[PDB]
Design an enzyme around this catalytic site. Structure first.
Site, short mmCIF file in Angstrom:
data_model
loop_
_atom_site.label_atom_id
_atom_site.label_comp_id
_atom_site.label_asym_id
_atom_site.label_seq_id
_atom_site.Cartn_x
_atom_site.Cartn_y
_atom_site.Cartn_z
N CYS A 8 0.88 -1.16 0.00
CA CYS A 8 0.00 0.00 0.00
C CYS A 8 0.93 1.22 0.00
O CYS A 8 2.07 1.13 -0.46
CB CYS A 8 -0.97 0.00 1.20
SG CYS A 8 -0.30 0.17 2.87
N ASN A 11 2.15 1.51 4.53
CA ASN A 11 2.41 0.23 5.19
C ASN A 11 2.09 0.28 6.68
O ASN A 11 2.79 -0.31 7.50
CB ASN A 11 3.88 -0.20 5.00
CG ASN A 11 4.12 -1.67 5.37
OD1 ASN A 11 5.15 -2.03 5.95
ND2 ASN A 11 3.16 -2.53 5.02
N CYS A 13 -1.59 0.53 7.55
CA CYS A 13 -3.00 0.19 7.67
C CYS A 13 -3.42 -1.04 6.87
O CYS A 13 -3.50 -2.14 7.42
CB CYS A 13 -3.85 1.40 7.25
SG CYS A 13 -3.49 2.88 8.22
N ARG A 14 -3.69 -0.86 5.59
CA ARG A 14 -4.12 -1.95 4.73
C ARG A 14 -3.12 -3.09 4.54
O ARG A 14 -3.40 -4.23 4.91
CB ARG A 14 -4.54 -1.40 3.37
CG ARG A 14 -5.91 -0.73 3.37
CD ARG A 14 -6.17 -0.04 2.04
NE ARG A 14 -5.25 1.07 1.86
CZ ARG A 14 -5.23 1.87 0.79
NH1 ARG A 14 -6.08 1.67 -0.21
NH2 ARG A 14 -4.34 2.85 0.73
N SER A 15 -1.95 -2.80 3.95
CA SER A 15 -0.97 -3.85 3.71
C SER A 15 -0.58 -4.64 4.96
O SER A 15 -0.53 -5.87 4.92
CB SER A 15 0.28 -3.30 2.99
OG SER A 15 0.97 -2.32 3.75
N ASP A 123 -9.02 3.12 1.25
CA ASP A 123 -8.13 3.51 2.32
C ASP A 123 -8.95 4.00 3.51
O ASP A 123 -9.76 4.92 3.37
CB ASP A 123 -7.19 4.61 1.83
CG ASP A 123 -6.34 5.17 2.94
OD1 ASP A 123 -5.97 4.41 3.85
OD2 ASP A 123 -6.03 6.38 2.88
CL CL Z 1 -0.88 2.23 5.51
#
Ligand code: CL
Length: 155
Positions: A8, A11, A13-15, A123
């Site tokens: 992402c 690095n 939150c999502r990933s 996001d």
């Molecule tokens: Cl992130």
């Protein structure tokens, strides 16, 4: 040792969530030592930082590990067998970073319901807990297909 990484922007939150959730499942499936799972970001302003708190909070709530240290995309990640991008911009960048189109794939493309045009994982950085809960749901919904991919390789 197969190597799959999630990417992402920051690095945090999502990933990082994808990384841990997938790692955990692999462990339940006894594939812990067969696959290596990491995550990195296209940006460099969070490097070395712990995962975003709201992110950690959702992982924790669902019983997943939260230990994490943000890393920026480097040689290490660019060398993975499969680079999984959270949204299409991450996909565009990894591509411009030298990775061939076939080794770059968007998470949602592994969703068993996915169409030809993969969806971005929105996001949740500017939201609250529920937003991360939602992201967790979206990710959980996508991972199964990534497992099919792994199974095939390991064979
Ligand atoms: Cl992130």
């Amino acid at each position: 040792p197969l190597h799959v990484t999630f990417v992402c922007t920051g690095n945090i939150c999502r990933s990082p969530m994808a990384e841990k959730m997938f790692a955990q499942q692999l462990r339940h499936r006894g594939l812990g030592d067969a696959v290596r799972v990491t995550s990195a970001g296209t940006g460099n302003w969070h490097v070395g930082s712990c995962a975003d708190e709201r992110a950690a909070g959702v992982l924790r709530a669902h019983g997943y590990p939260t230990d994490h240290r943000a890393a920026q995309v480097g040689t290490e990640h660019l060398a993975a067998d499969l680079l999984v991008a959270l949204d299409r911009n991450h996909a565009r960048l990894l591509r411009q970073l030298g990775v061939e189109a076939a080794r770059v794939r968007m998470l949602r493309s592994f969703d068993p319901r996915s169409g030809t045009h993969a969806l971005d994982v929105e996001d949740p950085y500017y939201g609250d807990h529920s937003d991360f809960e939602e992201v967790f749901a979206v990710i959980e919904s996508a991972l199964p297909g990534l497992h099919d991919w792994v199974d095939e390789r390991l064979a």
